[PDB]
Each structure stands twice: as structure tokens, then as C-alpha cells.
Ligand binder design. Structure first.
Ligand SMILES: *Cc1cccc(C*)c1
Lengths: 312, 15
């Protein structure tokens, strides 16, 4: 299976073997510990692969649900009184981290129900204190647009993953405004990374918008391939006209960009286009299931899991 | 030999 590494690693109660250093006691480290447990539960439940266990299906499902629930309680330790989240307990709030927590909790809600009011509070904190008038998001106190495009896309991903839990008009409006910022400022692109994160974020909303389809086509025109017809397909983080070389080895930003390209394409149901992409991702995966860093790892695992549910 | 980086090319070459 494509999801074999994380499945084996989660069932063994071991780490997924991400290469990068995650500082002890950081919110990101705790969020990344629950990440692989969710995608496993999500694969087994949605794909109906409790058959895998020949012992007791109901007992094993409960055992994973407990681990999932223990991860939730740990994440809550980083929550502030205003329902924002901090990277370190007692440190200042981060819009980025709050958006990352909403993505994880929004996804986990599917199988372990979150406190609806708590999620609402976090979403409203995010939208009312850190969205600018132009619809972009800012963090707590050419290069500016790139930073704004990144954080907005990243924040939109978090909001979209938690939206159905708290579909308030203030939040709906914030998404409309944030999506419009991305639609208006993504092309002409400055990097494939920023283009890819914008594309994936927009793919979680209105997939019929004409400028979303131009953004996606611009991303597809940055594709690197091996073979004729392509056996592998992937993306690097810099645009061809800025750096026209071909890469010799993998990087974190390469896997992350590729992952966002994959997730965008799966949301458009483009199953023919994706097979060479998963092939490449499958070979970049390490023993354990992790990749280079946290964000390339989360999105790559999501891509592999959603592909496996769509195809098998 | 890491075959996935052997003979990689741009799918839509600029030139
Ligand atoms: C194994 C190998 C070495 C150098 C180039 C290629 C394409 C393959």
C-alpha cells in the first residue's frame, strides 16, 4: 500500500521519521504527532480496511480513537484564553499556528467530535484581528506579496478544513475576501511554491472560478517530468524562467510544492495526471512514512491517503 | 543511482 509506512508506524506506536528537528514542547511537534494517527484512522474508516485486523476490529478502532483523543488534549495546552494558539505555552499567539491547529482539529472532527464553540472562537479570533481589508492575513508583530500570499493561502486551508463545524457569515465573508486576494494576486507568479499553495487553498472552495483555473493551468505548466510518456511528475519551488535548471535531488520545498500540486489535482478528480506524481512522492518517502520537514510531510501523507481511497 | 532524477525535463520547456 501507498499508506503502508505510516500504517505500520502508527500501529507500532513509533514516530513517522521526519528528518527535520522538532523542538521538544513546541505546538508544531504535538500537532505533527497526531497527524499520522488521523490519516491512518481516515484510511481504515473511509476505505473500510478494518479487515486488516483479524483480531478485534471494534477494539482496535477504539484504541486509535483514544490516541487521537489524547493528541487533542495535548494541543489544547497551547490554547490561550481568547482561543488563539501559541507555539510555546505562555508565548504570544500566532496566526500561522492557529491556522495549523484549525486544520488538524477540523480534520479530526470527522471521527472525534471537537468542541464546536471552541473552534468557532478560534475562527472568529483569526478572522477579526488578523485579516486585512484587502482580504489577506497578517501575523502578530515583491517579498511582501509573497509573504501575504503564503500566510493567506495557509490560513484559508485551516479555515476551509474547520468551516463546516462553524459556518458563520463573518467566516463565510472572510473566506470570500481571502479567496479574492488569492485570485487577484497569484498571477503573474513569483515562485511555484506560492502558486501551488494558492492553488490548493482555492481548490478547497469554488473550483469553477475562471482565475482559479488559470492559476491551476499555470501550475501545470511548471511540471517537471521524467520519461516519455511521463513515468514521474513533480514540481520544484522556483519558476522555470527564474531558474531553468533541472533538480538533481529532493528538498523540503520541492516535496511541499509537489504535495500542493497533487492535492489540487485530486480535488479536481484528475486521476490520470496524478499517477506519476504519487510514484515520485512514494520514492521520496522515508522509512516510517515521513519526508524532510513538517509541512511537506503533512500534505504528502494527505495526498497519498486520498489517492489510495480514490483508487483502491 | 537515484533514477527519478535521471533525465528529468521541463514538461513545458520555455524555449
Ligand atoms: C545512474 C545514472 C547516473 C547518471 C545519469 C543517469 C541518467 C543515471
Amino acid at each position: 500500500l501507498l499508506v503502508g509506512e505510516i500504517l505500520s508506524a502508527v500501529l507500532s506506536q513509533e514516530g513517522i521519521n521526519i528528518l527535520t528537528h522538532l523542538p521538544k514542547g513546541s505546538a508544531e511537534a504535538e500537532l505533527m504527532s497526531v497527524v499520522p494517527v488521523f490519516y491512518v484512522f481516515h484510511y481504515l474508516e473511509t476505505g473500510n480496511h478494518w479487515n486488516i485486523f483479524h483480531s478485534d476490529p471494534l477494539i482496535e478502532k477504539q484504541k486509535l480513537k483514544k490516541k487521537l483523543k489524547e493528541g487533542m488534549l495535548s494541543i489544547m495546552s497551547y490554547r490561550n484564553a481568547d482561543y488563539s494558539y501559541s507555539v510555546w505555552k505562555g508565548g504570544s499567539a500566532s496566526t500561522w499556528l492557529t491556522a495549523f491547529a484549525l486544520r488538524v482539529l477540523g480534520q479530526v472532527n470527522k471521527y472525534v467530535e471537537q468542541n464546536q464553540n471552541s473552534i468557532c472562537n478560534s475562527l472568529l479570533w483569526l478572522v477579526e484581528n488578523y485579516q486585512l481589508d484587502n482580504g489577506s492575513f497578517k501575523e502578530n508583530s515583491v517579498e511582501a506579496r509573497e509573504n501575504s500570499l503564503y500566510l493567506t493561502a495557509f490560513t484559508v486551508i485551516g479555515i476551509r478544513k474547520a468551516f463546516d463545524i462553524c459556518p458563520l457569515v463573518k467566516i463565510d465573508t472572510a473566506l470570500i475576501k481571502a479567496d479574492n486576494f488569492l485570485l487577484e494576486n497569484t498571477l503573474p507568479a513569483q515562485s511555484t511554491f506560492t502558486l501551488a499553495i494558492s492553488a490548493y487553498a482555492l481548490s478547497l472552495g469554488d473550483k469553477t472560478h475562471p482565475q482559479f483555473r488559470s492559476i491551476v493551468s499555470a501550475l501545470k505548466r511548471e511540471a517537471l517530468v521524467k520519461g516519455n510518456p511521463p513515468i514521474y511528475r513533480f514540481w520544484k519551488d522556483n519558476l522555470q524562467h527564474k531558474d531553468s535548471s533541472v533538480p538533481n535531488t529532493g528538498t523540503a520545498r520541492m516535496v511541499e510544492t509537489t504535495a500542493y500540486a497533487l492535492l489540487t489535482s485530486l480535488n479536481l478528480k484528475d486521476i490520470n495526471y496524478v499517477n506519476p506524481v504519487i510514484k515520485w512522492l512514494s520514492e521520496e518517502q522515508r522509512y516510517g512514512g515521513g519526508f524532510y520537514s513538517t509541512q511537506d510531510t503533512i500534505n504528502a501523507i494527505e495526498g497519498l491517503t486520498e489517492y489510495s481511497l480514490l483508487v483502491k | 543511482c537515484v533514477e527519478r532524477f535521471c533525465d528529468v525535463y521541463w514538461e513545458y520547456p520555455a524555449v
